[PDB]
Paper text:
Two CspA orthologous proteins, BGA71 and BGA66, that are capable of binding complement system components C7, C8, and C9 and thus inhibiting the assembly of the MAC have been identified in B. bavariensis, allowing B. bavariensis to escape the attack by the immune system. The importance of BGA71 and BGA66 in the resistance to the immune system was supported by the gain of resistance to complement-mediated killing after expression of either protein in the serum-sensitive B. garinii strain G132. The overall fold of the BGA71 protein looks similar (Cα root-mean-square deviation from 1.66 Ǻ to 2.63 Ǻ) to the previously released crystal structures of the orthologous PFam54 proteins CspA, BBA64, BBA66, and BBA73 of B. burgdorferi.
All three BGA71 constructs were overexpressed in E. coli, but only BGA7162-251 yielded crystals, suggesting that the flexible region present in the other two constructs interfered with the crystal formation, as previously observed for the BBA66 protein of B. burgdorferi. The final model of BGA7162-251 was generated for residues 69–251 since the first four residues that remained after cleavage of the His-tag and residues 66–68 were not built due to weak electron density. By surveying the crystal structure of BGA71, we identified cysteine 173 in α-helix D as the residue that forms disulfide bridges, which is responsible for cross-linking of the two monomers. Furthermore, comparative sequence analysis of the PFam54 orthologous proteins reveals that cysteine 173 is not present in any other orthologous PFam54 protein, suggesting that dimerization by cysteine cross-linking is a unique feature of BGA71. The structure of CspA showed the highest similarity to BGA71 among the other PFam54 orthologs of B. burgdorferi, with a Cα root-mean-square deviation of 1.66 Ǻ. However, the lack of binding complement regulators can be explained by the inability of BGA71 to form a homodimer in the same manner as CspA. However, the proposed N-terminal residues 37–63 involved in the binding of C7 and C9 are not visible in the crystal structure of BGA71 since they form a flexible loop region connecting the protein structural domain to the cell surface.
Numbering used by the authors:
A (entry chain G): 14 to 125, 137 to 194
B (entry chain A): 12 to 194
The structure:
Amino acid sequence: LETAAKNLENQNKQEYIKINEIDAQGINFLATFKADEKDNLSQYEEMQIKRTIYSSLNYEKQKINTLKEILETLYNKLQHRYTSKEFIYQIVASIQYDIDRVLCLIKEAIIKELLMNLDSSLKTRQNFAKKLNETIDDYNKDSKNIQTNVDALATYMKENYKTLDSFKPI
Amino acid sequence: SKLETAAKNLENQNKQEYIKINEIDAQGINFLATFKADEKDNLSQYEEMQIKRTIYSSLNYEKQKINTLKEILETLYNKLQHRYTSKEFIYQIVASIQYDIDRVLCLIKEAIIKDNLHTQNQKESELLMNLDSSLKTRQNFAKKLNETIDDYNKDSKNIQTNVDALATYMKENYKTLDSFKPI
């Protein structure tokens, strides 16, 4: 348990320094979301999202940029705006948060079913990553017209990121 | 959102704490050596860091005051008679002040995320009160801790010169974790 905390902690710092490296080159990934005055993308929330995304896409700028275009392209159509937001604030944040929650519960133990809870929530982020990479690949091949047609992109994203629980292990 | 801009001030202050601690530690000052070396209680490097979080903050990152504390806890540790007072301070008082604060930030964060889901059950004022509370505890602690570095260096009530005085004093001044909370 101490060893999990130790490893996971070390993973968190490594992600943090990698995210900062990428963002220093001025790729404002969630720029369009930061600019939104309806919700408030807190600095903290911005950061949690990136942990999942950046890690998922193995810190490859080109890929982060490709996804930026999908989120932005749905964002630029009022009809599908909720789809881009729900992805970020509902799926991606929930995948990330869950990992975090267990690590509080692991810390709370060390200082007073957790290892299968930690197992699960890390695994849920592995299955998301895999799905996301397929999606980046699918986009660049304009499969199901999800590059030329934003209606298709909406359908595809809706269908492929329906619920948090679908990325969980069986 | 006050809750969001609470998460932000703890986040960056957490970070700023981390870079100072690692710097002070870099210079070979072995604050928790004696406690790490202990078989009976495994002290994790997280556990250790969190403890430093409350102590090095409270002593304003001044090495002198840290090694004077080091001198106190090791004096207490090496007199078998009084060795558990050294740990209660470390593990039952220090590690309890720090832990309340990180627990609130876990909860503050949950509430922020759950807001975006539309499933926020946590009352937003309760978390801020709890935040404002545990911060104040650690400052009440910090104030006590500098009193105790001053006294030791002046040998007040024979605290430097008699370990039985020192054990009494630390028990008097660091009795319960609630003894530093506001009212």
